[PDB]
Design a protein around this ligand. Sequence first.
Ligand SMILES: Nc1ncnc2c1ncn2[C@@H]1O[C@H](COP(=O)(O)OP(=O)(O)OP(O)(O)=S)[C@@H](O)[C@H]1O
Ligand SMILES: [Cl-]
Ligand SMILES: [Cl-]
Ligand SMILES: [Cl-]
Ligand SMILES: [Mg+2]
Ligand SMILES: [Mg+2]
Ligand SMILES: [Mg+2]
Ligand SMILES: [Zn+2]
Ligand SMILES: [Zn+2]
Lengths: 431, 517, 121, 127, 438
Amino acid sequence: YFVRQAAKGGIDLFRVFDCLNWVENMRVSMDAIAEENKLCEAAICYTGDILNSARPKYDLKYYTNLAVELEKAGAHIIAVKDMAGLLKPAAAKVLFKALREATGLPIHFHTHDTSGIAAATVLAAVEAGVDAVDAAMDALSGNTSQPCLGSIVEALSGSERDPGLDPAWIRRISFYWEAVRNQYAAFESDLKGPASEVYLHEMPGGQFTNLKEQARSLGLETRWHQVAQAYADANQMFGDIVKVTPSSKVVGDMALMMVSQDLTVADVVSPDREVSFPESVVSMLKGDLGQPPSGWPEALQKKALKGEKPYTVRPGSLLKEADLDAERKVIEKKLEREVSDFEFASYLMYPKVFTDFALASDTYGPVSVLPTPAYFYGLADGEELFADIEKGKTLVIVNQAVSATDSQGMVTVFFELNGQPRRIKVPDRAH
Amino acid sequence: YAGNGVKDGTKQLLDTLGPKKFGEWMRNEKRVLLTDTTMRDGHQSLLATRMRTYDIARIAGTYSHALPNLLSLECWGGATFDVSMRFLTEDPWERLALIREGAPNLLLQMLLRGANGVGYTNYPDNVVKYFVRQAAKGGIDLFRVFDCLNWVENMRVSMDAIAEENKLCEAAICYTGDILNSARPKYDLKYYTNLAVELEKAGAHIIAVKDMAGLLKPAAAKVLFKALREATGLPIHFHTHDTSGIAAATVLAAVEAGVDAVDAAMDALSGNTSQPCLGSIVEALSGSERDPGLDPAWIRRISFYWEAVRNQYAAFESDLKGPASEVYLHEMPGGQFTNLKEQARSLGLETRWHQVAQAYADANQMFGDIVKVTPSSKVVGDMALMMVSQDLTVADVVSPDREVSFPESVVSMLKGDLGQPPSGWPEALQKKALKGEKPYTVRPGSLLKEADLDAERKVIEKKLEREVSDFEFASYLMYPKVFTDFALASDTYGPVSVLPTPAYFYGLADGEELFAD
Amino acid sequence: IEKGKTLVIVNQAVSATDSQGMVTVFFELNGQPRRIKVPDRAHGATGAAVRRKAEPGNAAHVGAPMPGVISRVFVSSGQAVDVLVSIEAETAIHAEKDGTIAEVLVKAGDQIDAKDLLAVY
Amino acid sequence: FGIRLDGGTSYSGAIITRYYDPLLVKVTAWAPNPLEAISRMDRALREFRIRGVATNLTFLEAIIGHPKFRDNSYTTRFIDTTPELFQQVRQDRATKLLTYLADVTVNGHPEAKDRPKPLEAARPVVP
Amino acid sequence: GPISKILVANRSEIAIRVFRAANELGIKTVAIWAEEDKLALHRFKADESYQVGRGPHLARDLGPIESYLSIDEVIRVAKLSGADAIHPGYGLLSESPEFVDACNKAGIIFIGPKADTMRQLGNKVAARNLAISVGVPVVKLVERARHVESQILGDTHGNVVHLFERDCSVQRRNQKVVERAPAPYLSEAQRQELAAYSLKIAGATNYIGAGTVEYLMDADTGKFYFIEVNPRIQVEHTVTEVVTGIDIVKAQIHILDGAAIGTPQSGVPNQEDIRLNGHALQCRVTTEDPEHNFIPDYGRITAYRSASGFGIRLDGGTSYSGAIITRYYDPLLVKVTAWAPNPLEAISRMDRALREFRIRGVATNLTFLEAIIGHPKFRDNSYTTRFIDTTPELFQQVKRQDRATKLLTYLADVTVNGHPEAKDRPKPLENAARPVVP
Ligand SMILES: Nc1ncnc2c1ncn2[C@@H]1O[C@H](COP(=O)(O)OP(=O)(O)OP(O)(O)=S)[C@@H](O)[C@H]1O
Ligand SMILES: [Cl-]
Ligand SMILES: [Cl-]
Ligand SMILES: [Cl-]
Ligand SMILES: [Mg+2]
Ligand SMILES: [Mg+2]
Ligand SMILES: [Mg+2]
Ligand SMILES: [Zn+2]
Ligand SMILES: [Zn+2]
């Protein structure tokens, strides 16, 4: 149902992945995508090092065999999703040559620039004949993001695979993103640049900052390089797994526990050391994220589950079909109104988040139309704001005064709205 | 924690083979050789060159024991020489001695300007020679010598002095433009290979490609390094900056094409306007034919040390966020970028920064399309700022009917003080700017006499009321006022270089304890 | 002060000594705020009022158009009609005439107020 | 033009005490015709800026803006028997949006309020 | 359609003056501001506001005044905002035919006369011949001169009226300092002779909007001589408004909306119903320092309290305690207009208000204004255009006791540094009971 609505909503290209590269767990979505007559780009996540003979689990044939399986499962495009930016240039030259010999499907490469060398890997993939690559505009590229689009394009300018993209226009659009990004100062991390330690821990670019902040919360900021090592150790302890949403979160939870509780992997699996496993770890070892090709390590699984029996079937194969008619009736009754098919899809994915958002929208109306600084900070005294509620149809809003807070604990804000006075009361949320 | 004892490295090969056969050893070496720039160019780019001796000297032992296969530590010259005294109240000679002591197995490398050593203006030949002599005595083994216009004649005096001291003379060619762009043929492939031949004939032991703005692209590196190694039998050494976010691709392409050595910065001080990331470059080469034989785990342990050191220098971080392909438009050196943006902001132009970057490109072409690296890069910067400030197009700048008061740096460059570009200076611009002063086309240093060194020595010695060492005298010759101020502050404050960095910049909080040796 | 002219004076606040060795006493006088600066002679600031002080008349004087801290000094001996200093609050104070500047009273990461004398031709 | 003030007592920093009548200023508006005089009084009252204490300005404005004040049909009982002088109603999109703006202006945003702020900064311009 | 949004292409007191008229008419306003005017009150007094003179559409930031003279900037923001009309105030672009042209090209109403009216009146050859052609005398001497000017209003229907005259003879160097309405040295017959000349000029030029016909009057002979028409509102319009009861700015607006003078909608009476009621004068208070050769002062204003009461009109809205006076713009703090039934009483009323003002932090010209209106030649209307420049007693330094400031200085000094005689000697028990006079 969700895939159906996503296609109706305007998605043309669905990049579908599985956090353990389990093709079985991808078939329902791949079928749904083909059913809607959209592009099914089936991704294989990259981990390990195909050129390192000491880690043969994730060798070249592992990837070429998955490409073959995904094609037989009906992919229109195969992706290599290098969520942690681990694919090295020499490996890309071997991998993309081999992939394009293994399947006739086009290949699409996605990577992250955590190591500071991912553009080298992209350009190696292009030289090797890869069909499509991802990059981020310069102003939002590098480090844990994608490598730089403008520089990758410039590198290929005048070559036989020149993408035909105007660098001056890439620059202009990046300058726009730079200015946009300045508005989001609150959400910047403290990362200063490239880190080869990524090849040690393999934390996905999308995880790295969250996990580091989460370590800081637990009083572990000074032990971050120990968390990164515990993350590597825990990965091996779980059997050496693909780490991307949500399996990456499990390995992070485990690593933080090891550092907080001073436990080595030997303590973790020990018969005689009581361990309270993170709920994400118990759930993964139970089977809720699916099955890695060698299965879950048994001594670990047994200890963590505390008598609860694991399963190995596809997790969704255990769930009863939803009564969509009944579920729709439920949300509509809560909101005391009809919902669109899109809102229904939202409610099915995130019932609580959607419901809360639907109530907020009823209270505040169309806040998405507000420019970003007004959204996050509101209006200073005497400050003017222009906002379009309709495609006419500009509101000129001025903050003229804000009262002290009464008793009833409310505050009155006095606006001018298109030349007219407008008084609005709101709680003082700190009294 | 390291070991053991220290294994012999490139320092011992230089000592026992001599510079010319050491370069032959480099050429023959199958593995790529690595220079770590963390102790000079890395913090010059990222932290305004404010990294202190205390933090640098304390890790040199670790490098010596853990990464004994490194070609060299680039640890001296560029801005460190004056910044150490003027802003850090410490002696660059002492810093170099401590590194030497801590890392007796690795070559110590400086960046030297051919025309003036480490100085800020032109000096007589005898002064430049005296400085090179002291640099050699103080512990420098490998001198990367460059000229801001790639003018070989302006490099001869320094090259000959380096060879006289029996140290390594690594003559750099600065990279600009794009050799694979046949619509900018001025800086084509023959331009570089002809220069490499000229520099070999001038007595170089090693040729460098100095890509100060990070403009060399991977496909161009593949062609360039192949051609260079066919043009000269000398080893080739590649230095670039990561402003574009793709410079590691170029370094790896250079390695594949057979380049003998490459520079990189420890991860914690790499990326953006610094060099590309050392640990990731070494990881990319791990297990390959040219594997440099450097332990990644030790690189990461030293990088973690640099990360904690860098945190103490929060005052000196810039607001740069990431890669910029804009570099291919402007060609500002990575070492200039932040300085020039900070200057624009101080002139009230922060909101017209991208306009300044375009004026910089236009101004470069107006000057005839020149090599831009210290000091020529500053001249183009001054010109660009004035063009934006006063709303002057290149046509306005050169026109006979618009009055312009050119920046001093521009007048001096067109006069001839920075040397001669291969094309000469554009005649109409030079005439307008010089306002009747005659230009010269000879080597600037040929017009300066000989300094009277025994008399200059008595001047500083009288002022300080004591004898000074030959090293101190070299400091005074290069930076008379800065050295004088430093010697007087050293008299009052003692060896402040021995204080930990937080105590140096912020002193002690109440109840706080420090240890100083 | 005279018969029928009664002032009401309150001591509202006394500042820390500032970088010029001056203490500000914030008075209320007849209900209106009045700030009065005196030297902190008690802590060794005899010889103090410090910063001149531009004369609105002369040409000659480079007076600060606005309060702030100086962020950069671009000069110390003469030229044009050119940025002399900048002030952060960055502006960007330009030379109004051709000349040789014969004094730079800043300085700075110095705090200044409008009318403070920045430089003298 | 046409505004007379008899105040002299209020200023920035004045303290209003509980001891006497809580008068700030007396405002007199003049025009050739009574409706213009009202529009003049209304512009002046709305242009005053008094902060730090509450005022009766919105009440004065409601009175002179009332239809019965404008047509001179009021009696001595007018205020005491006219509820709309002390009330107000709206439910539309713009009001909801002003409700958001008010709420964030007073309370800040939970995701932003304790985090680093953007420099005090060029708005993004679509090429 | 009828004007519903006006952009004021100006700043400071005249912008605030127009905002008041427009808002009183139920018309929305738009302010423009240069970066140097970022804290200027006019910016916050409009319904909507736009910065002029910065931004990527320009090659370089414009100067503080340059920003407001930029026809391109003004038109750009007028379009952005959807303004129906532009009021140019006075100064800046108010006499620029190029600007009127730009307005018309954009379909925006210019509040003032046509571009061709401006061109004709701005050339002295044309202006003189037009006056000559309708039998208005033109300039001889004039060694003892007065400056008298008629206020006119003309509408788009061929109606012109006069709002009588102002005396503007009190000038320093060549700049207006005190203006009066009506001119007190005129007889009724003279007043009507002047009105008839002015109506001739207005009608001959088909004048639209507010304008001023300026004359020189030879004090020795009583002869009038036409000098120029100023084709805009003027800073001294306020005295005329107070003695006639007619709002000039609202009249400008209705006239450009198409109203006919004489109808209630125009805001303007027929000529027969226009009359003088009492006497007024206006003084502009500025930061020009009589102690420093009238060099304008600048800096933060630490205290500002105006003075009003019966017969006082204020046109300010720009000074307040906290405000910073820059040197970028004209140094006006506030324009004070005083009215009374008779001229000597209006003088006494101005004098009281000016002396009751309190402005601290910057110097002002208050003592100089006081000196002028306190002078016997001002009181008896015997001054000429040379009065100020030839009257040194006006420049006499005042010198205040300034006793309270000195006492506060004493109290601060002793509070922070102590008294040398109480030093380290015993202190009174800190209670401590004041002596009570029995
Ligand atoms: N013929 C004259 N004889 C004596 N004084 C004159 C004469 N012409 C002009 N003036 C003086 O100049 C003043 C105004 O001159 P104008 O002719 O109006 O010049 P202007 O520059 O247009 O002035 P404004 O600012 O537009 S009113 C008068 O009030 C007189 O003081
Ligand atoms: Cl949810
Ligand atoms: Cl020096
Ligand atoms: Cl200007
Ligand atoms: Mg080799
Ligand atoms: Mg005139
Ligand atoms: Mg004129
Ligand atoms: Zn990703
Ligand atoms: Zn460099």
